[PDB]
Amino acid sequence: VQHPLDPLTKEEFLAVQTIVQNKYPISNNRLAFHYIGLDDPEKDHVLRYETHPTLVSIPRKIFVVAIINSQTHEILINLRIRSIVSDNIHNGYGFPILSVDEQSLAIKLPLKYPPFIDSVKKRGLNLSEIVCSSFTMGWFGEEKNVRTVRLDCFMKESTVNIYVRPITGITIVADLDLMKIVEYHDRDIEAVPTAENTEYQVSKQSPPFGPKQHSLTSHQPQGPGFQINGHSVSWANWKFHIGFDVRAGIVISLASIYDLEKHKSRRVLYKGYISELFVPYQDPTEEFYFKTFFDSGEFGFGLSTVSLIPNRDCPPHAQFIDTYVHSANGTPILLKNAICVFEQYGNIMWRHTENGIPNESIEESRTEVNLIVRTIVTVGNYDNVIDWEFKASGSIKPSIALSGILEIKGTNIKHKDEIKEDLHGKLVSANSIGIYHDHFYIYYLDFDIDGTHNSFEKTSLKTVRIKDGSSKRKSYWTTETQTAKTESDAKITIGLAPAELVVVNPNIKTAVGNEVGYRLIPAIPAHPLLTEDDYPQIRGAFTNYNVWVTAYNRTEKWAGGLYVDHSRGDDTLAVWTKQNREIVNKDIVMWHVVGIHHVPAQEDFPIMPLLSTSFELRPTNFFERNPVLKTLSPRDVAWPGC
Amino acid sequence: VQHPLDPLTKEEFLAVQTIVQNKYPISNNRLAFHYIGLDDPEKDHVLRYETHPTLVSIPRKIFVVAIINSQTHEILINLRIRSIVSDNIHNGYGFPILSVDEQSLAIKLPLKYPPFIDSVKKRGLNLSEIVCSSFTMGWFGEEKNVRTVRLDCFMKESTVNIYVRPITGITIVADLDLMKIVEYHDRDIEAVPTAENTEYQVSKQSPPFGPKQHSLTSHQPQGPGFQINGHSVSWANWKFHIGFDVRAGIVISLASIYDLEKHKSRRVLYKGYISELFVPYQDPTEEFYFKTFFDSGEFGFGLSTVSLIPNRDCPPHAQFIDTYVHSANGTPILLKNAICVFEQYGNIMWRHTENGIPNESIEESRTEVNLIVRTIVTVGNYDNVIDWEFKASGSIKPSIALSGILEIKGTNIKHKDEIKEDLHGKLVSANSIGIYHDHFYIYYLDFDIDGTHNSFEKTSLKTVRIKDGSSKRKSYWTTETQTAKTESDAKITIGLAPAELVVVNPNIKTAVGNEVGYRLIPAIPAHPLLTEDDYPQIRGAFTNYNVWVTAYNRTEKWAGGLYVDHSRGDDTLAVWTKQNREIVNKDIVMWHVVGIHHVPAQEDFPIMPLLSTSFELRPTNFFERNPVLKTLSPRDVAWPGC
């Protein structure tokens, strides 16, 4: 019943807590769990299990990152035999994911800190309605290596929208290990933006409302087209596994599509997730220079996954999957409605109207039903709606949509005509600067296109000029396909030259002889605007290209490095690929960076309408012909479906 | 009841036919109507009519392009008084949109032409199962200016999928005025691809089918959220007018959004349509060198609009709008279900989960209902699904999706290993080359952002390096806004440098002082790969940039020129902008070129799954704040049961 790639259960978190506590009792040890996740089973074992799932036995192994007595420990546990197989101290740079508990403690410190109390009083602000939040500080060339954060504070009072009410102008640094403020500098007095009209909760808003949106009700006469057996999904011609990890968030594994013509299930994607985020702000002053969050490695995408609100975050009749996370003391926490799965209707699958045959009317239009797997991750002010969409046609469409709250920098300025220098953002409301920033996400995409042995092909589009009278045309374009030999050949800056980027299996061809493959259709690319030598850009060097390909390696999981808080950037994707390994006809992995540059506008305030992005992974000579040529539209059914 | 921008009614087409026949009787004149459309009412009159629609009287004026006795006539008619106001002969280069009737005659010619009959017999093909199609030939520097086309032929037999069964290797040129074949060269014998498994009609396919897709049934308890009064749509906070023209196809006009905070209807888009298409093939041999269709100007997007199939091309409960087109003799033809309007559910409008306030759980997620207006244009083998999507948030999202059939070049080659030279396409099936080609579409977007006096702003994102020790950061980015002064400043190649492109009203600002505007968020851009001096690229010079801005001019409607068939490219958007007019704080128009490079894959055969493209027009300081801050989700209703 339990699949080897399943997320950790309540029971497994408790056994981990127990096994680690046994070695390090809380009576004589300060013990904090900062990561508890499944140690990836060896791929060859997983592939053996797939073909004989009743026979192949894989032990559940757990990787744990724990701070014990102010030292970072890496602990591997075999849960079958309830033993610790290894326990090593991390000696390199960087620190684990911040825990929720230590943040909850850190944000109370300013409220009892006499210099903060005096700064607050001098501004005439109500101390009892201040909330603070912990921001990571990264690394800026210093040799000092301590677990410090910056604490920023905000007014609440008549609104819960705290992020639009900063108390701007105060430096507070807190050491999380010591749990105390180690630096304080009250620099500038800035007005706190009003609470008026910042409220986003319907219960706290007043009329008028509008425009009115008409309701819709719907029903599937034969129920859902997908079945979830534990974490294993069967839907239409697809099978895949839904996993979940406290750091990565959602993980799509073992994605295979049934080829009706060949009567065989065929692998596309062994493993797909978001490996890291990078959200660099563009305000170089003391107020914000340090704010370039790596959400996944600094806060945990899984740890920060929210409960989906039925009928809103997912359509009605969506099916929900609960997951478990853990707290700092190792206790499992139920995360209700962490993921949902639903079907989407209305799309045209394909069509043709034929009018070229005299005296014949021919038309055919068919519709598709698509599958969406959705999860939502909220880190502080940003909400990220993460979707994986599957289509019978074989396309997979990973998408990310952004909402939430702008990070506001407070200012005395009320109108644009008062601005006399670069504010490093747009004035989106009185006293409110929306600071310029980027969102970069990098996907790990372990394609095993019809098997593990794959290659990466760049199909360049090139212009040929005809000068020799051999045609009336002066020009045309044609393709020129190059196989990337090493990792340096697969570092692509999209938009420099026209090309299709394809992962193929060179060992498997269609009957006419084309290598089977999948191609990336990207959205308009964001490129880094920081300099390559800037400290946050070194740490976020995984954003240096839009696409990368590496040789598959178990231990290469996290693009910003295993330890991201205060990282020096000596363990990123950029660093790994300096080895310049061979990537021809072997197990390879694609990494794809997506992102936007955010120039805030007034529409983003006080809460922001969804901005949707997407890319498509499209079968490209994977099938002999259109895989949905023989796929029928869903039947028409008169309301109410009986 | 009749709005000035309404499409031509049956009655109006008949009056036009009558008026023109009365001056040019068919007893003494050869008369063909190639275009009959609404002569655009003057803008200042239309704006006056909007404010007083019961009082302002605009005469319906009709523009007609007719070939009369082998001369092209331009005829303007005032229908109120049933008179011809002007009748001028076109003396320049190029010819009108091909009529359906003359093509029907032209495609029969090969079947009675003894050299074709002999060429067909020599290949052993069944003459009674051959169908031919007329292809435009453009212009390639020759001084000759006649209405010729290339005729290509196809086998039918056990399939209606003719385009995948070419008879390749025969040149046939026919003069449409003379209605005869004026050139014939049988060059090469190529195998005709098999009919086997080319069928896309469900009634002509055999098992097995799959995967099974589950049905859905739906109902709106309070009916549709939109009303259509004639051609004027009211939905949510939008009003706009749906028009139709035999050349352009669908036209969206007078799009205004109600701003609840200001209690006022505010203009965004005066007029939006697809002005031209350009589909250059990349085979320079005698077989295809000439094939670079300008769909709209050569065949008519409106004339080529198909009837939408209920429940397939549009979801159930969509509302349909009939239009009229015309035949060559000027008779109105009813086009049932030419356009549909429906509402789309499921999207998150915005959300936030707040976890930063100790001991408080705060979450809010709202959904939006969006509006889709759809039409489908099929020219030969290509099907284009054209959508205009409106959102309560103010975004407009025009989209184009592509399906239909590949244009196949027949060949004796069965496997890729047999290929010894550039075939100018991919081998997608035995004997079947899918020839490389592009699709370029150009949109006319007459934004009148909260009024007619607008400017075009390029907000460049620039990297600044800090060297002088004033920050721990080495770098950041900021914005630099430049207003385009003249047309040369507004010719944008997207992807060269990072920037937001915004149309603003410089005379209207938000209370905090930002200019009201709308911004373009484009898809990954296609750029021309023909040389600029190639004959098709001169004719299609409107594709030379992704974005253009011109001063509003009534007569500048068609980006490839008024007369496209055999054009020399002396009347394109590129030519008009050599005037380099001023475009600061005045009535301006944006043109946006969208497109793809199509490298055919086997999945595209024998009929192709939908490839969807889109861009967003997003309000950018247009509103004081998030316009849907106070918009409530549609109410949830439980399935009633049985």
Ligand SMILES: *[C@@H]1O[C@H](CO)[C@@H](O)[C@H](O)[C@H]1NC(C)=O
């Ligand atoms: C400060 O805030 C508290 C609520 O947390 C309120 O009871 C009190 O009256 C406030 N003080 C002032 C000066 O407004």
Ligand SMILES: *[C@@H]1O[C@H](CO)[C@@H](O)[C@H](O)[C@H]1NC(C)=O
């Ligand atoms: C896997 O990658 C890491 C470095 O990123 C390295 O320590 C290890 O040797 C690699 N293993 C292989 C098989 O190359």
Ligand SMILES: *[C@@H]1O[C@H](CO)[C@@H](O)[C@H](O)[C@H]1NC(C)=O
């Ligand atoms: C040619 O096709 C017709 C049907 O259009 C059929 O009746 C006839 O027998 C065919 N002849 C050959 C040579 O197959």
Ligand SMILES: *[C@@H]1O[C@H](CO)[C@@H](O)[C@H](O)[C@H]1NC(C)=O
């Ligand atoms: C309006 O457009 C036409 C065609 O491009 C041109 O001949 C005319 O001069 C234009 N008006 C101005 C003032 O540019």
Ligand SMILES: [Cu+2]
């Ligand atoms: Cu942002």
Ligand SMILES: [Cu+2]
């Ligand atoms: Cu195409």
Ligand SMILES: [Mn+2]
């Ligand atoms: Mn792989």
Ligand SMILES: [Mn+2]
């Ligand atoms: Mn305008």
Ligand SMILES: [Xe]
């Ligand atoms: Xe995004």
Ligand SMILES: [Xe]
């Ligand atoms: Xe890919």
Ligand SMILES: [Xe]
């Ligand atoms: Xe498209």
Ligand SMILES: [Xe]
């Ligand atoms: Xe725009």
